[PDB]
Amino acid sequence: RDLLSKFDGLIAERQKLLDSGVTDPFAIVMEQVKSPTEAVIRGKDTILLGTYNYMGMTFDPDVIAAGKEALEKFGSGTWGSRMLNGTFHDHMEVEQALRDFYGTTGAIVFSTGYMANLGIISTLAGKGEYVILDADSHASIYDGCQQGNAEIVRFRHNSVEDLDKRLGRLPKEPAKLVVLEGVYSMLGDIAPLKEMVAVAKKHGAMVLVDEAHSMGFFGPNGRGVYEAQGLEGQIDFVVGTFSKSVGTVGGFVVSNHPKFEAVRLACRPYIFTASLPPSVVATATTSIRKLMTAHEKRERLWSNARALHGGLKAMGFRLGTETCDSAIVAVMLEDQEQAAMMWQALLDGGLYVNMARPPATPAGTFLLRCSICAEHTPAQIQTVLGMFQAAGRAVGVI
């Protein structure tokens, strides 16, 4: 036995899953990519409906041009750590873009969204303090809790009442961080942030909201679910990513806290990693600025989402949400085999959606998750609906 013997179980179960299906959903490799919404997968022209490219920014001509120009002028990489080795002025500029986008006095960029959550949670809450989070929080949030030395306080999924009860029972004096997500990504439903933030404030807790799945298309300024729900000026920290709507890699936290800059001095995942490459920062900055006024993209994204949600519901698919509340539409299937057969039929027919099954989802939940793009056309969404109807009828789902 050695350090990898602990994975013998995972190896056996993976092999079992792969034997029982055709295409390995964990090893999808695109061959050629035309657009935000079309690629060649397994030799077939395929509509992409399983990516997080919500605002279709990744082929925006200004975004691409900024990236190319940055490569030319500043090269492929960086000096090292921003704090230790210095940085290009582009990093100051992307932080300014985030200040402008969110209307905050503070913005700190990280190498990934994962690291932004890891770093901010583990740095803000120390020994004897509390992080309070939804039981079904994103892995990066749990990992931030694990990295830190605070107490962790789970509350029942989507329960304002349980948040209130659990907070109320904690010792009064120690500082507290309530961490919420605007969009629950599994089913594409939305958190009751207005009510939960009121509860947090009643108990004197600070609030961090992850707005990774809402950027550019929730709220008057596209800031997120918190903005849509009227919470401007009440959220202590907002965490996000560049990897969904913005169209690159990176993470960030924004805040109006007057001591927010001190996070740079203490945050190990910020200090001990190289700064992002010029092309990445340039694409992010250009994209973020365009997202401030991308009303047409936002319009199409929501029209497409509502068309898909309403259309699938009308066909008799069981969806994760009664109304179209985000750009994720989740189709719920009866069992493992049905989910795989449906997913495979869709793929074979020219549509790629995300399949989520246990243990990624709770036992008994088997999903096909559709993530809409601002650059899908109405015709493409109609094609998608037809593909779902055909595959659903063939497999026996509807």
Ligand X SMILES: *Cc1c(COP(=O)(O)O)cnc(C)c1O
Is there binding between residue 318 and its own copies (CB under 8 A)? no
Is there binding between residue 129 and its own copies (CB under 8 A)? yes
Active site residue 244: yes
Active site residue 185: yes
Burial (CB < 10 A; 0-12, 13-18, 19+), residue 13, is exposed
Q: Which of 122, 123, 214, 241 binds ligand X (CB under 6 A)?
A: 241
Is there binding between residue 259 and its own copies (CB under 8 A)? yes
The residue ranges of DSSP E strands in 159-261, in sequence order, are 176-181, 183-184, 189-190, 206-210, 237-241, 251-255
In degrees, rounded to 5, the angle at the alpha carbon of residue 344 between the alpha carbons of residues 341 and 350 is: 140
Is there binding between residue 113 and ligand X (CB under 6 A)? yes
Is 157 or 268 the residue whose CB approaches its own copies more closely? 268
Q: Which of 113, 222, 311, 392 binds its own copies (CB under 8 A)?
A: 113
> Which of left, alpha, beta for 100 (phi over 0: left; psi -120 to 50: alpha)?
alpha
Contact (Cβ atoms closer than 8 angstroms) between residue 220 and residue 182 = no
Question: Sign of torsion, CA 176 177 180 186?
Answer: negative
Residue reference for tokens 């593909």: 387
Non-local (6+) Cβ contacts of 181 within 8 A are: 134, 137, 138, 141, 191, 209, 210, 212, 213
Annotated binding residue 241: yes
Contact (Cβ atoms closer than 8 angstroms) between residue 275 and residue 249 = no
- Minimum distance of ligand X from residue 139's CB (angstroms): 8
Is 6 or 295 the residue whose CB approaches its own copies more closely? 6
Is there binding between residue 138 and ligand X (CB under 6 A)? yes
Question: Can you say how many angstroms the Cα of residue 335 is from the centroid of all Cα atoms in its chain?
Answer: 26
Is 124 or 193 the residue whose CB approaches its own copies more closely? 124
155-174 positions binding its own copies, by CB under 8 A: none
Is there binding between residue 112 and ligand X (CB under 6 A)? yes
Contact (Cβ atoms closer than 8 angstroms) between residue 362 and residue 221 = no
- What is the distance between the alpha carbons of residues 31 and 39, in angstroms, rounded to a whole number? 7
Considering the candidates 122, 185, 245, 371, report the single residue annotated as catalytic.
185
Q: Which of 46, 122, 123, 140 binds ligand X (CB under 6 A)?
A: 140
Is there binding between residue 369 and ligand X (CB under 6 A)? no
Q: Which of 243, 279, 286, 361 binds ligand X (CB under 6 A)?
A: 243
Site string for its own copies, 295-314 (x = CB under 8 A): --------------------
Is there binding between residue 285 and its own copies (CB under 8 A)? no
Per the annotation, binding residues for pyridoxal 5'-phosphate are 113-114, 213, 241, 243
Instruction: Tell me which residues touch ligand X (CB under 6 A).
Output: 112-114, 117, 138, 140, 181, 185, 210, 212-213, 241, 243-244, 251, 273-274
